[PDB]
Structure formats: C-alpha cells, structure tokens
Design an enzyme around this catalytic site. Sequence first.
Site, PDB file in Angstrom:
ATOM      1  N   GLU A 117      20.987 -11.330   5.349  1.00  6.44           N
ATOM      2  CA  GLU A 117      21.517 -10.002   5.665  1.00  6.44           C
ATOM      3  C   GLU A 117      22.135  -9.353   4.402  1.00  6.44           C
ATOM      4  O   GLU A 117      22.898 -10.014   3.715  1.00  6.44           O
ATOM      5  CB  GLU A 117      22.573 -10.070   6.800  1.00  6.44           C
ATOM      6  N   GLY A 257      32.166 -13.610   4.664  1.00  7.90           N
ATOM      7  CA  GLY A 257      32.889 -14.524   5.525  1.00  7.90           C
ATOM      8  C   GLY A 257      31.951 -15.514   6.199  1.00  7.90           C
ATOM      9  O   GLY A 257      32.082 -16.714   6.029  1.00  7.90           O
ATOM     10  N   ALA A 258      31.010 -15.014   6.989  1.00  7.85           N
ATOM     11  CA  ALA A 258      30.090 -15.901   7.685  1.00  7.85           C
ATOM     12  C   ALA A 258      28.880 -15.106   8.213  1.00  7.85           C
ATOM     13  O   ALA A 258      28.837 -13.873   8.139  1.00  7.85           O
ATOM     14  CB  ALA A 258      30.822 -16.664   8.843  1.00  7.85           C
ATOM     15  N   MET A 259      27.895 -15.816   8.735  1.00  9.35           N
ATOM     16  CA  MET A 259      26.633 -15.182   9.063  1.00  9.35           C
ATOM     17  C   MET A 259      26.052 -15.753  10.363  1.00  9.35           C
ATOM     18  O   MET A 259      25.948 -16.981  10.524  1.00  9.35           O
ATOM     19  CB  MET A 259      25.632 -15.304   7.893  1.00  9.35           C
ATOM     20  N   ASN A 261      23.108 -16.133  11.787  1.00  2.44           N
ATOM     21  CA  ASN A 261      21.653 -16.485  11.894  1.00  2.44           C
ATOM     22  C   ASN A 261      21.433 -17.256  13.194  1.00  2.44           C
ATOM     23  O   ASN A 261      22.219 -18.159  13.513  1.00  2.44           O
ATOM     24  CB  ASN A 261      21.194 -17.352  10.719  1.00  2.44           C
ATOM     25  N   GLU A 294      30.923 -14.720  14.932  1.00  6.09           N
ATOM     26  CA  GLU A 294      29.499 -15.056  14.721  1.00  6.09           C
ATOM     27  C   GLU A 294      28.858 -15.503  16.034  1.00  6.09           C
ATOM     28  O   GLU A 294      27.684 -15.195  16.282  1.00  6.09           O
ATOM     29  CB  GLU A 294      29.327 -16.137  13.641  1.00  6.09           C
ATOM     30  N   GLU A 316      28.380  -4.534  14.474  1.00  2.00           N
ATOM     31  CA  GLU A 316      29.651  -4.953  13.835  1.00  2.00           C
ATOM     32  C   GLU A 316      30.888  -4.391  14.552  1.00  2.00           C
ATOM     33  O   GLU A 316      31.863  -5.120  14.766  1.00  2.00           O
ATOM     34  CB  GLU A 316      29.695  -4.646  12.326  1.00  2.00           C
TER      35      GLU A 316
END
Length: 866
Positions: A117, A257-259, A261, A294, A316
């Site tokens: 992303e 920060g984080a993803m 997936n 997430e 978001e």
Amino acid sequence: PQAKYRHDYRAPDYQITDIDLTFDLDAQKTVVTAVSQAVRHGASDAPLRLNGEDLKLVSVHINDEPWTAWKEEEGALVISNLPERFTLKIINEISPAANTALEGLYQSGDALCTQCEAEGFRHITYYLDRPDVLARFTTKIIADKIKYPFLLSNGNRVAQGELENGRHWVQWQDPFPKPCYLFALVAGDFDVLRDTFTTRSGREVALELYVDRGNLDRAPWAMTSLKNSMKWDEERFGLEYDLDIYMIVAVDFFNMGAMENKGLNIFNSKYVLARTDTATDKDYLDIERVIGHEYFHNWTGNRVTCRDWFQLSLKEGLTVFRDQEFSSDLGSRAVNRINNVRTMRGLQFAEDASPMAHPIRPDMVIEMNNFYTLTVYEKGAEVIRMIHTLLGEENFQKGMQLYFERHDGSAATCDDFVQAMEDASNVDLSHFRRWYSQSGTPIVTVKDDYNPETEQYTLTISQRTPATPDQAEKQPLHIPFAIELYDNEGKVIPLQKGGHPVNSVLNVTQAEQTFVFDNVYFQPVPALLCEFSAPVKLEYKWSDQQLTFLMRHARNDFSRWDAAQSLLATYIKLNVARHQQGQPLSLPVHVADAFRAVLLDEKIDPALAAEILTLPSVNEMAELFDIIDPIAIAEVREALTRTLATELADELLAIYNANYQSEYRVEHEDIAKRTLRNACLRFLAFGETHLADVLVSKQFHEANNMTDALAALSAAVAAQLPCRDALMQEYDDKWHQNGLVMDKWFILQATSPAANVLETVRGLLQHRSFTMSNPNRIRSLIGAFAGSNPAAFHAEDGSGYLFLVEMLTDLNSRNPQVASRLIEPLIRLKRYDAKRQEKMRAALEQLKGLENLSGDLYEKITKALA
Ligand SMILES: NC(=[NH2+])NCCC[C@H](N)C(=O)O
Ligand code: NA
Ligand code: NA
Ligand SMILES: [Zn+2]
C-alpha cells in the site's frame, strides 16, 4: 512529477481476474514470475498499460507466445494488440537488499517482507496497480531453507515441496479477490506464538504471531488484543473473521504503523512487542488500538475496498472510527474521546491550516504516500462519528449492514458509503456530503440571550470556513451541534419548543441561524459542542465562572475536561503575550482553585482528574494563535507548571502518595490511578528542587514497570533535575541493545529543554543505538526534535532548520516516505514570524534544488513555497 486528479477517474480498459505468482527468493536478486488471466473491457485498440518501477524485465508472453507488440516507458509496460481474453506471463527481477525505501519487497534485518500500500506492488512486478482491479492470488515462494524456514503469503497453504541445493517452497492461495495493495509476502526465521479463536458461529481460526527469535516473551499482549478485537467486532458490528488463519508478522523496519494485508498483517514491532519492564501503559493501549485497527480493516478495507486512492478515507476514516469505538468500549470512553480531541485540535487543525490542507476525500495528489494523513484518518473518523451522531447507533448499524450488502466483494467510493447510511436510515445526507469535498476547519460562533419574561433561551449560531491554500471557495456545512443547558443547581433543563421536546443535536446548516428554546426556567449555563460533536473551532464568550461551573457540574466527563481547556486557553494566550513583553506568569487565584478542587474531589474518576491535570501540549497551545511564538509557548507551559506546582504542592504530594500501587496491572482502573499519580509527579518535579530530585530519582529506581520508570525519567529531563544525567546514563547502560526501549530515550533527548539540545541530538547520530537505516530510530531522534521540540527547532539562529536540511538531504535518497514525514515542521513556515519564515523558506529552497528530489518532497516543498 505529475499530479493526478479525482475527477479523471475512469474504469479500467482491462481487468485481471486471477494471478499466479512465483518468487524465486534471494536478497540480492529475486526472480518474479507472474501469470495473470486478463479480460479487455475497453476498445479493441486500447493497449494494456501495466505499472512498474525499478523492475528488470526478463520476458513477456501472451498465451505462451513470446510477445513482440510491447514497449517500456517511464513507469510502465505498454502491451498492444491483445485479444479480448488472454493469459499474460511476465518474468522480472528485483533486488530486495537495494530497497532502502521499504516499499515493495525489501529486507528487514534478516527477514524479507513486503509493503504494497498504496503503490508498492508495481515495485515487485508489472501490474494493474490500482485498487479497483481485484484478482484471486496464488503465491508460490521458493527459498533457502536455512535462511528462510518460514515462507508466508495471504490465505492458506495449499502445496509445499523440497528441492535440491537446500531450497524449499510453499504455495498459498487466498480465495477472496483483492487489489494488489493487500498482497503480502514474508520469508525468514521467527518464533511463533500460536493460539486459536472460535467465532460466534463456530469457525475456529488459527492465530499466529511471528516475531524475531527471542521475542516470544513480548508477544502475548498483542495476541490477547487480537482475540479482544475479534470478539468486539462480533458484539458491536456483528462481523466475523472469514478465513481459517490469521497471521501477524512483527518487523523492525517499517515506514508507518501496520498493514492490513488479508490474513497476513505486517506490523511495525513498536505496535506488537510489550513486556511490563519495556512498555508503558500508553504502549499497551497503542498496541490494542493498532491490532484492532488492522483487524477492523478485514471488513472496512478488505471485504469492501477502495475504487481509487482518492477514496482512502472510505476505509481509513471508518476504520479509525472503529478502533476508537473498540478502545472506548473496552476502556474509558471519556479518556479516549479526550485524547482523540487533543489530536484533532492540536495536530489535525494545524494540517488543515497548512499548505498541505486537503479535504478528507482529496481532489489532487502527486505522491499518494503523502495522503496518509491526520486529515484522512482522524478528521475522516470525526466525519464518520458525525454520521453516527446524526443517525444514532441503531440506524448507523443498519447503514453498515446495507453498505456490506451492496458492496461486499467490490471496490467502493466515499459516496457509496454515505448513500448506504442515507438509504438505511432515511436521514438526508446530501448537504452532509460537503464534509468530504471541503478542506479547512469551520469556525462556529455562538451568541446567546436569556429572556426572563418569556422564559426563552435563544442561540444565534454562525459558521464560516476560512479559505485554504487548496480551495478559494468555501460553503456552509451540515454541522451536528450538541448542546446541554444547566440550571443553577447543575441540573439539565429539558430542551423544548412550543410544547414539544427538541433534539439536543442541533442541525447547524446555514451561515447563520437562530434556535429558540421555551420553558427555560432559569438562566442557563450552556455546554456547547458536547463531546466535540463536530470537528470545528468554537467561538463563545465564556466567563471563568461558567467554565468552573461546568468543571463541577457537567453530565459528561468530556465536557468537564473541555471546560478546563477553555478556562486554560484564556490564560495561555494572556501569558504568551506577557512572555513577549518580558513579564512573568499572571494567573487568577480562582483559576488555581479550580485545579485544587479537582485534586481534592473524592468523587471524580481519577482517569478524568488525570486529563484535567495534564496541560495542553505545545502543539495544542500553538493552535490558539495565528502567529506561533514557539519559545514563548514552551516557556509559558513550563511557568504554568511551576506556578501550579507551587500553589498546589501539598495537595499534589497527597494525591501522588494516595495513588501508589504495589501491583502492576494493565487494567483500566489501575491505569487511571497511575496516570493521575504520574500527572502529580510531573508538577512536583517542577516544585522545590531537592524534594523534586528525591521523588523523581526514587520513582525511577523503585519502579516495577516502564510506565513509572519513564514518567520519572521524563520529569528529570523536563525539569532539568540534578539526577537527570545519572538516570539517563543508567537507562542507556541497561537498554542500549533494545531499539524500541531506546526510542523512548531518544525522544527525551530530542525534546529536552536544555540549552545545548541540538548539540546533543547531533552527537546522538553516532550513538550505539541509533541508525539512519531504521525509520523508528530516525523518527524518535530527528522527528521528535523537529516536530516535538518546536522551541529548539525554531531557535532564532536557524540552527534547527539547517540540521533538518542536512538530515533530509540524506533521507530524500534513502527513504523518501520517512523524509516526507520529517519535512512537515518546515512546511508550516507561514504560521511563524517574518524572520523565521525567511530562514525556513531558504531551507525549503535548498531542498528544492536537491539532485534527484523525490516526488514525496517535491509535492510538499512546492506547496510550501507557493
Ligand atoms: N507506506 C504506506 N503508505 N503505508 C500505509 C499503510 C497504512 C495502513 N493501511 C493502515 O491503516 O494502518
Ligand atoms: Na468503556
Ligand atoms: Na449572551
Ligand atoms: Zn487503516
């Protein structure tokens, strides 16, 4: 670099339905084979335009035929003369070890991992790298078995094999079509924390947290939060996980920060790893937030994705709203709302006043990584919460249900979501949609009148949004404006007009309007914009006594805190003007008495008391002024702390002692008492020196947890106490090998009020625990200096600007995303005095002339210099 525009969106000429990836993995040279099933939707003469960046093309086949009708152009592979349906095969090479930008396939220590992303998948292979192209993925991974014993991708393991020469392979299949930004690959050696979660309907999900060897002791809280998130999404939103396995990988090298997936989240380790001696209460609550965040994306982002990147807030804004609701449900709703409001007023409002101002749904983007913003995320969530305020929980949930029913399995727009809320609820949101297309903070002006003859209270409410750098035209918004009216006993006066109740959420839709309420039996003290019901600046002429009355009587704990903020704002403004004249702090006795009352109130929730006793940050204070004087603000914040420390010394010590806790628990009541105790310690640190020194030093050494150790260390630094250097050296000696723990210490160094802070910060570039290769370290030292030490960053000699220029000259080439986060303090130049503006402008002009200026920096520099 070229701007892209939301109004130019067009459906794609080609779709891809299925992709089969093979990675022949190596850190120096990875070979990617991608076999895509494609369909032409456009004209027979439209070519297939594939995005691709820094790829070495090996071959192109169409239905197994080596293809001659193609060309490479800047960022693209353009393939001509294609049938209506065909198999595309691409072979290409990439180099993970050369990837210092950390976008695409890169190296994090000894691990290989991805970040796709927004547009990173084009750094892996030639693709339709746009989120309205969803496809079913299979992923085969071939690697050295000793170096990479774990080979992970989205979905379930469907095949595995061993090869000669010490290699092995695993193949994964994810049944849900996805845009490629949700693709992930991880290869490495890991400790694995394994657990299970059984969904409401009985689906047993295997949960796996992969962490570096030796970190399993820091994994259970993240696992606990994951299970908490899964349960909450079920109870609150009726949403269950939809796969058989849930993987999270914690990596040390990660830009944000984080993803989310699908089935394989990749997290910055700062949002996973926690032990009581390494992590604070705020770290535990941030882990809980981000883990939940997430997870919540599984529905709001994955099952329904974004048609294009201008729709980013669709996922978001909605997911931030969900993580806030999660945190608020599990913990203190008041503390959550208070902290989210600080962030809005103190950080987001500043962005909405800046050259980078944009609507929550942007119209123009040069580099999409620049739009992962306070605006898109935090203001996006306030916009979702306004829909919730307008609709109520039940209608909101009906809208959620209609949104998924319509859009599950597809890429949607912000407008689609608003439409679902409107259709499910029958609340008209046509005017409300303007919140998506208009930037800037509205200013809401309130005048009132009490008529004793008619027993009527009249509110005259007006709104305007000042022009922003991106938009010359502004219009009135649909502002939900929540009010309460209090009588002389502190009781709520029922809102009514002409014999009928009136909703307490006023629909402020005009430039100016009048609301009249009847049967108002006593002149009211109003609570206005309750629970920050719209993301706006409130202009109302409060008396001090109205505010102290609300502090004492307001029904919602948020309103009590907010009244204290309005009380303080007046005196912060006063004292910044005084500082500029060389005058000392002036504060009425009755203001100090208001805070004494909070300390001595035995009924007040300690969580609320702690927030009232936490002074607005220098960032929140900055948004009270048109022109920011960062030195005056920093000095006034200190002096106000010193005044309250002196005036409330005995009370502060008593409350500090009363809230002592021998057991450490990550439990909301314990956290609240600890937050109050450490708020008292901060004031005490700025009181009489010898007592301060003994208290702070004793807490540091006696702490059985990092929250209390860091609160003491931070006070020693803030108050420049005798024991400071000793405690700082002890922490370094104990923790230097632990990057995440050292980040706390780098932040304390970076934000030190000491005269020589810049000199210390420059020296720390050589520190054993610092490296320019690691975004966390960079942000904790350099980022904290520029962003969270505005007094030193804005030193009158321009030394702060020059330092940042030096750092950005490196980072522009190394990691432009991190460089773009760090340039933010420099692009605020128009908020500062002429002399500072001219220096910041010179710094920006120097960066503009960099050889190989990244699009990331170019976008911000050009907006700033306009
Ligand atoms: N490098 C980036 N642009 N990362 C963006 C990832 C953010 C992720 N979707 C989140 O909500 O946390
Ligand atoms: Na709660
Ligand atoms: Na009035
Ligand atoms: Zn998100």
